[PDB]
C-alpha cells in the first residue's frame, strides 16, 4: 500500500517460484542489476533452484554484474546458454572459459542502443527489483538504474520484485531518461552534472506487469579492501600530477567532472584525494561507492551522478539509513545516460579507472589473462576513456608476489589502444603520455611505471625491438614471450 | 579581388617571404586534408629555405597532404614532429626509421586536445582560401579538415589564395566551434544537412600576418577503378543490406552513409548504384568519385564531408560545374563531421577499409608486422565507435597468396572487437553482432578467409580452444604469420 500503489495490481502479487515458473526454455530475460546494486534476487533463486528439478537455457542481459551469488547459481544450474554485458562471480567466469556459457561483453552505454536499434535480440521479459510502484503504475528502482528502463519499455512482461530491504525513500534519487529516436534524434539535454532531464520512476503501461513479488533482502555489500602503501602511492602520483597541471594552469583547483571505476584499486585512489587541495570537485561516473561519501563528508565533494550505488556494510547502513543528508548531492541515471559518449565528452569527465596490464606503448587490457582468459569484462573503461578529457589507468605495477608484471612489452588482449590512453600510473610513478610518439611513450613507461625487477628487461626488449625499427618497435619473437613464460613455467621471465 | 578587405593587401608577399616568418621550434597548423584543400606555395618555400638554413618544426594538418608535401619538409629535415595524419612513402620512411616523431590521433579528437589545454597550441597557421571576405574572414577551399580551430588557436594567420579554386566555392562550407567547458551546450545539428556555423572562419583580421597568391591545383584521388574483387565486396554488402531491409531491420535508405578514403571503400559506395536502395544521405568525413556518382545516379540526395579529392576528369566536372551540386554539399570542420556525439545521434552505417583482422574481429588500420606505420587510423574510430553498423573491408589476401589479410591475432590493435559490427571479403561476409568471440572465429573463418588460409586458421582456432578461454589463443603460434612473413617471404613458410 505504500509499496504499490496502484491498488488493482494487488491481483499480480504473487511468490517467487510462480513468477519464475514464467520465464521457459529459449527465452531472452533483462534484469536490473549493476555491481551488485538493485538487482533482482527471489525470482532469479527461484529460477535457479527450479532448473535443477527440469533444466533449461536462458539468453541473460543485465545492467552489469550481480551480487548473491546468483550467476554462481545460474551457471551451476545449468540455466545460462548466454550472458550480458558483465559479470563478477567466478563460478560463471570458469563456465565462461571452458566454453560452457557465451559471454558478450560490451561497452557499457551501448546495449540498449543495439536493442533499440534492431542489432540485438530483445529481452522477452523484464525482472526489475522495486522500492515503489507509482500511482500511474510506474516503477520506481533501488540502489541502481543500469539497464532497466530499456528492459522494462522493451520486454512484453514485466516482472517487479518489490523489495522491503530498501526503503521507499529511494524515490526521486532517480532520472529516468531514454533518448529520442532515430532518425530525427534530439540532443541529450544534459549539461550540468546535476540536471533532472527524465522522471523519478520508469514509466510504463501497466497492463504489461504480468507478476509482482515480496521480497526482504539485502544488497551484496561492496568487498573493496581498505588502501594500503600502494594504492596510497598511486593516490599520490596522480596528486602530484593534477598539482603540477593546475599550477600550469592547464586545470582548475575543482578538477574536472571524476568518473572512477569499479574495484579497490581506483575507490582507494578516490580515498587518496582527501588529502589534496583540490576543492568543489563533481562527480560524472557510472559506479558511486564509499569514496564518493568519505569525499561528500570531507566536504570536497559537491555533486555525484551514477548509475550504482555499492557501499561496504557500515557506510551502506550510514548512507541509507540517513538518505536525507545524501540525497540533495546525488542521482541515479541509466547507465546509457552516466556513460554516453555524448556526455561525457560535453563534460570533459576525468576518468580513473584500473588496468588488468598495460604496455610499453600505452595499451590497455582490462579483461583477459594471458590473452584468453576473461575476468569480468571491459565494463564501462571504453564510453569513459575514448572521451574523456583525461583517460587515467592505474594498477599495481606487479601481482604474483613479482611472478607477473603489469607492464608487459605487448599486452595480451587490447581493451583500449594507446589513443584512449593519456595517463598511466603505478605505484612506482606516473607516465604523462599527451601528445607522445611511441617510442617516447615507451621511455616514459619503462622510466616511471614498471617495477625494478622488470625494468632492465623491458628496457632490453625495447632497445632490441627499436634496432628492428619501425614507429611501433617489437620483437615478433618476443612480444608475447613474458605471458607464455608465465603460463609455461609459472614466471614472466622464467625463459 | 579575392581579398575584400583592401586593408589587407598590406600583407601582399612572396611564398618565401611568408615562410620566413615560420620560426625554428614552432608549431605549425596547416590546411590539408588527404590531398585537398593544403596550402602549397608556402610549405614548398619552407623546405626550399630550410636545405640552405635548417628549422624544426612539428606539423599539424587536417590529415594527409598531395603535392609531395610531407616528402619535401621531410627530406629538408624540416619535421621533427608530424600529426595527425599522413600518407606520404618519404615521410613513412623517415616515421619508421624514428627520424620523425609521428601521433596519430583519432581525427575528431586533435582540436579538442588542443582547446582544454592537453596539446601544444599552433603558434602559426597556414590556410588555403578561396577568398577573405570584407570582415577578413577566411573562405576554404575544397577542405575544412583543422583550418578553423588552427586559424583560431594560432597567434599569427599565413592566407594561401589558390586561384586555381573558385570564388564560388564560398557558402559550402559551415565553420563551428563548439562551446567551451564547462558550460558546454550540444551541438545542434540533428539532421546531415543542417547549417549550424558560419561561411568562413572567423578570426580578427588584424591575426593575418601574410597573404601569399598561388595558382595551383590539388592533387587528384588516387582511387582505382573497381575490379572483380571489389565487386565481389560490395555485392556481399549490398546482399546484407537486403537481407535487413527484409528483414524489417533496416529502411530502404540505409542509415547516413560514412565511407573511407581510398579504392575499396569508394568501390563499394560505387556497388550501391546497382542496388535497390533508395535516398540515401551521407554524413562522412571524405568525399569521393563514388559520392558524385551517387548523387548523378539519383540514389545520393546530400552529402556531409570535411573534405573533397577527386580523379582528375570528375574533379573538372564538379568543379567546373558546382551549381549542379551545391544544394546537395556541405563542409563541416573533420571534428564535426567526426564527432562522436554527432556519429552515435544519426546512427551513421561506416564503411572502412583494414589493414588486416583477426578471427576474434579485431582491426588493424596502420601497422604492418606490428611495427611499420601505413597512414594513421584517421576517422575510422571515431565513425566505428559510434556508428551504428560499424563495417570493415579488405580483399582477403595481398602479394600472390603470401599475405591473408584474416589473421589468427592483429598484430596491432586499431579497432578492437567492441567496435566492429561487420567483417567483408571477396570470400563472404561475417555479421559478429551479439556474437562471442569463438561464435565469431566460426563465422569470420567460414565467411571471410581464402580457401587457402581456412583450413591452417581453422586449426590454429581449434588447438586455441583445446587451451580454453573466453578468447581461444596460441601464445606461441599468435604472431608466427607476421613471423613467417617478414624472416622467410610468407605468411604460411615456417
Redesign the interface.
Known amino acids: 500500500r505504500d509499496r504499490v500503489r496502484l491498488p488493482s495490481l494487488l491481483d499480480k502479487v504473487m511468490s517467487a517460484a510462480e513468477a519464475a515458473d514464467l520465464i521457459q526454455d529459449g527465452m531472452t530475460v533483462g534484469m536490473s542489476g549493476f555491481t551488485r546494486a538493485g538487482e533482482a534476487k527471489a525470482v532469479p533463486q527461484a529460477l535457479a533452484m527450479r532448473a535443477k528439478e527440469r533444466p533449461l537455457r536462458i539468453s541473460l542481459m543485465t545492467g552489469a554484474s550481480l551480487g548473491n551469488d546468483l550467476d554462481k547459481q545460474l551457471t551451476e544450474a545449468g540455466v545460462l546458454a548466454?550472458r550480458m554485458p558483465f559479470q563478477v562471480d567466478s563460478t560463471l567466469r570458469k563456465a565462461?572459459?571452458?566454453?560452457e556459457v557465451?559471454?558478450?561483453?560490451?561497452?557499457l552505454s551501448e546495449t540498449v542502443?543495439?536493442l533499440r536499434?534492431?542489432?540485438?535480440?530483445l529481452p522477452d521479459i523484464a525482472v526489475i527489483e522495486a522500492a515503489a510502484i507509482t500511482e500511474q503504475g510506474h516503477i520506481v528502482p533501488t540502489t541502481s538504474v543500469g539497464n532497466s528502463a530499456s528492459f522494462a519499455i522493451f520486454a512484453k512482461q514485466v516482472i517487479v520484485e518489490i523489495n522491503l530491504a530498501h526503503s521507499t525513500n529511494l524515490e526521486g534519487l532517480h532520472d529516468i531518461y531514454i533518448p529520442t529516436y532515430?532518425?530525427?534524434?534530439?540532443?541529450?539535454?544534459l549539461?550540468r552534472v546535476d540536471d533532472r532531464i527524465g522522471s523519478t520512476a520508469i514509466p510504463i503501461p501497466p497492463e504489461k506487469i504480468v507478476a509482482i513479488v515480496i521480497n526482504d533482502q539485502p544488497d551484496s555489500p561492496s568487498t573493496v579492501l581498505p588502501p594500503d602503501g600502494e594504492t596510497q602511492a598511486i593516490a599520490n602520483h596522480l596528486i602530484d600530477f593534477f598539482k603540477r597541471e593546475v599550477d600550469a594552469?592547464?586545470?582548475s583547483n575543482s578538477l574536472?567532472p571524476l568518473q572512477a571505476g569499479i574495484g579497490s584499486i581506483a575507490n582507494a585512489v578516490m580515498c587518496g584525494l582527501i588529502e589534496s587541495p583540490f576543492e568543489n570537485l563533481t562527480m560524472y561516473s557510472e559506479v558511486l561507492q564509499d569514496s564518493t561519501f568519505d569525499l561528500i563528508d570531507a566536504g570536497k565533494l559537491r555533486f555525484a551522478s551514477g548509475s550504482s550505488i555499492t557501499l561496504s556494510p557500515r557506510r551502506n547502513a550510514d548512507v541509507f539509513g540517513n538518505l536525507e543528508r545524501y540525497k540533495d548531492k546525488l542521482v541515479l541515471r541509466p547507465q546509457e545516460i552516466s556513460n554516453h559518449?555524448?556526455v561525457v565528452?560535453?563534460?570533459?569527465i576525468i576518468g580513473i579507472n584500473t588496468a588488468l596490464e598495460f604496455d610499453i606503448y600505452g595499451?590497455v587490457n582490462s579483461t583477459?589473462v594471458?590473452?584468453?582468459?576473461?575476468m569480468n569484462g571491459?565494463g564501462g573503461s571504453?564510453d569513459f576513456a575514448?572521451?574523456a578529457?583525461?583517460a587515467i589507468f592505474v594498477t599495481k605495477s606487479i601481482a604474483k608476489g613479482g611472478n607477473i608484471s603489469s607492464v608487459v612489452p605487448?599486452v595480451?588482449?587490447?581493451?583500449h589502444?594507446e589513443?584512449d590512453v593519456?595517463i598511466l600510473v603505478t605505484e612506482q610513478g606516473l607516465a604523462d603520455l599527451?601528445?607522445?610518439?611511441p617510442?617516447?611513450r615507451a621511455r616514459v613507461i619503462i622510466e616511471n611505471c614498471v617495477h625494478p625487477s622488470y625494468q632492465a628487461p623491458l628496457l632490453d626488449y625495447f632497445e632490441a625491438?627499436?634496432a628492428?625499427?619501425?614507429?611501433?618497435?617489437?620483437l615478433?619473437?618476443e612480444?608475447?614471450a613474458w605471458?607464455?613464460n608465465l603460463?609455461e613455467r609459472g614466471h614472466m621471465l622464467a625463459g
Not at 565528452?345 to 570533459?348: N, P, Q, S
Open positions: 548466454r565462461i572459459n571452458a566454453g557465451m559471454f558478450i561483453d560490451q561497452h542502443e543495439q536499434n534492431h542489432q540485438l535480440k532515430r532518425p530525427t534524434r534530439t540532443p541529450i539535454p549539461t594552469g592547464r586545470m574536472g559518449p555524448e565528452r560535453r563534460l570533459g595499451n583477459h594471458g590473452g584468453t582468459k576473461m571491459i571504453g575514448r572521451n578529457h583525461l605487448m595480451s588482449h587490447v581493451d589502444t589513443h593519456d599527451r601528445g607522445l610518439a617510442r617516447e625491438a627499436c628492428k625499427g619501425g614507429h611501433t618497435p617489437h615478433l619473437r612480444a608475447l605471458h607464455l603460463e
